[model samples]
Target: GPGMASSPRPKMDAILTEAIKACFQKSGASVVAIRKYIIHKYPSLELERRGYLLKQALKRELNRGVIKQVKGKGASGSFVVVQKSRKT
Candidate 1:
């Protein structure tokens, strides 16, 4: 893992996009692991702000069609990353 000292952190949304696309390309991810791995990599800010970051960003992406519900079935319980699939 490199450092972001010389470079600046990208937008939160973009970060999550790449992250999901990077690891959860096929399986997708959860709001839990998303923040977990993200912060594990960057390690900044506080749970207070990071908490809202997930809310506003993920919810926005969900409604915006960037991603869809996978293993979840409630308002604020479970979640994932990918949005599309095809028959084979």
Candidate 2:
């Protein structure tokens, strides 16, 4: 156990996730949709790269209040429920 090093978790604010989810949902992109877009539209790219591209695309719309979260595998297990509209 002593030999094991845990990966560092990013400091995420609760409101940030809420905001990101709202923007993503507004775009009609679920976690699954992102994965599908990459696999189907850009078959040549790997998953990691696709994820990064997706993150950037999501972040580009500052007006939509989209933020990024660094999560581990399978964090996309559940649907991201939008709590409220973010002020732009």
Candidate 3:
């Protein structure tokens, strides 16, 4: 089968994922937090019209399993890093 045509952008794409990583101040964070960081750090960058880049970027980390999302109303909308102590 032909390889998929989707991939992370090299320019702002770098910014999107970088913001994802930096916003995890508490070992976990949400799309809301990362969006604020993107606005503060790169105000002029045009996020997707549907504003889906952030979520996709979020799942980028989430899908990798190093980060996972929590359940419940109070704990909703946040992704926590697995932080498996790198003793291997």
Candidate 4:
């Protein structure tokens, strides 16, 4: 059965997801809105220090199907969480 190596599962930070959900709880928000919230609140820390910038982090989650885009057109649409990742 060991024919080849298996890829590692994608990991998402629980805290990050929680904060994102809180920010988008009211309704769908644009990626910029989410990014600004995180940046404004945690200015001392850099998102890049963990892995990705605010934009990349949101896009990664979106690509994973956890975050859903609604209304508007692509790149200008609002985003919301369809399914949240379990807390670690």
Weakest ten-residue segment in model 1 by summed lDDT: 79-88
Per-model TM against the reference:
0.47, 0.31, 0.42, 0.41
The sequence of per-residue lDDT tens digits that candidate 1 reaches over residues 1-88 is 4766586676876777665555455556556656665467655536623657764565555566644543344464445435443111
Against the hidden true structure, what lDDT does model 1 obtain?
0.56
Give the candidate order by descending TM-score: 1, 3, 4, 2
Instruction: Give lDDT: candidate 2, residue 84.
Output: 39
Q: Kindly list the per-residue Cα lDDT of model 2 for residues 46-88, writing each as its tens digit.
A: 8534556554544443324343332322456343323333222
lDDT of 1 at 21: 56
Off by over 4 Å in 4: 1-12, 27-29, 45-51, 69-88
Identify the leading candidate in terms of lDDT: 1
Report the alpha-carbon TM-score of model 3 versus the true structure.
0.42
Q: What lDDT score goes with residue 23 in model 1?
A: 47
C-alpha lDDT values of all predictions: 0.56, 0.45, 0.51, 0.51
Model 4 agreement with the true structure over 1-88: per-residue lDDT tens digits: 5778788664445445554665455554346665555566566346543435655667776666546532233444334323232221
Off by over 4 Å in 1: 1-10, 45-50, 63-66, 69-88
Candidate 3: stretches off by over 4 Å:
1-9, 26-28, 44-49, 63-88
Encode model 3's per-residue lDDT on 1-88: one tens digit a residue: 3788878656866565444444454444566655665566655536542346766676566676634432222454343333332111
Task: Judge candidate 2 at residue 68 and give its lDDT.
Answer: 33
Per-residue error for 5 in candidate 1, Å, reads 19
